[PDB]
Design a binder for this molecule. Sequence first.
Ligand SMILES: CCn1cc(C(=O)O)c(=O)c2cc(Br)c(N3CCNCC3)cc21
Length: 420
Amino acid sequence: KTTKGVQLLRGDPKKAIVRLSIPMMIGMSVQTLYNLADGIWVSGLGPESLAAVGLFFPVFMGIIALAAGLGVGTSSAIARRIGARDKEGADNVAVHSLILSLILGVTITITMLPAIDSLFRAVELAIEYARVLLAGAFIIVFNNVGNGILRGEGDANRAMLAMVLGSGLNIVLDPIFIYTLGFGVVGAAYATLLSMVVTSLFIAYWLFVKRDTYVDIDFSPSREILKDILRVGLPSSLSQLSMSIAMFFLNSVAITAGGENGVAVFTSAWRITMLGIVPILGMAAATTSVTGAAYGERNVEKLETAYLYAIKIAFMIELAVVAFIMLDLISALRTLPVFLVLTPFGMMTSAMFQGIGEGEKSLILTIFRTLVMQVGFAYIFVHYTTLGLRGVWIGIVIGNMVAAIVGFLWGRMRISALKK
Ligand SMILES: CCn1cc(C(=O)O)c(=O)c2cc(Br)c(N3CCNCC3)cc21
């Protein structure tokens, strides 16, 4: 009838925010540690292989964006059916998403793999890197969908295990296929492939075989469900997309402000802050589940409680994290991380927008945060001020301040509108 994850969402919102974020944090931690390590192995492979990276990166990030967004849409739609105590509706979303993962999965493969040979034309290495990655696009999507099912139910521990067993297998298999065996840059993708396959066997085990999930995988092709999944899924894909593009724009700002000296400082600072933003990414994922559950119950008070408690806790964790960092890049490690305490005020709001099904507002807030304020102010402090590399860090921090104020008020505004 019930499950430890579903009994968490339907109960004390303060306990739900905590008990669900912690496993998500550990999962995201290993995930970020992979990105840190995978970038290192690729670095030093030569200039030709790095040129191949920038060839497939816009396509690579396209696949990950579509997959991650769809998973969020799955998570959002399942949490809302759980809150409304709608079992058959919660079962229907899961089956719909798995079919959605199949269609979207094979579509990406059939629409890109034959058309990747012409768009690229270092080039040969990119096509091979594309070939391995595109051939397993359906696997990547299924993973995020199966992840969204668990994350939307409250199975934060089984979802944590997914990415931990996930990223962990890649941290190990990365140097093996890149250096020991000697595939090169393509070995990173082949490590990614082989890793993704193993975990897709573990997810299908829990879902289909073990049946430990709250939902039963009742199915009937409904338009309301399809509208409900894409309403959050589609804008979330553009959110992660613009987030990477912001990293590219900020890079060119670091190019103008300090040069190549220079850009290396920005890459070092962006690495340590990626690990320091994990408690926010881990809690934002938990917030979407709780607020979504609260939205289904039509309990605004509980929704407001969980949204305000997720910020307060994450704010004080960051105060601690900032303290870790405080005690060239050494100068920027004392001014830049101050944007990490402003971040939970904005990331939690967009996450609760996804929770209540309004993904469009989540996309607008994210664009304003990552592009308009972060890149916008950083470009301004570097082109119109005597400050060089230092002004870039100021712009990011001062940009987050504005995006935090707008985000928090917009969040409290819509929470007030949910009563009238
Ligand atoms: C070994 C599977 N895997 C490989 C990766 C890679 O090679 O870059 C991943 O980034 C990855 C990420 C997640 Br989240 C992840 N999870 C969460 C979603 N379900 C599958 C496990 C798995 C990943």
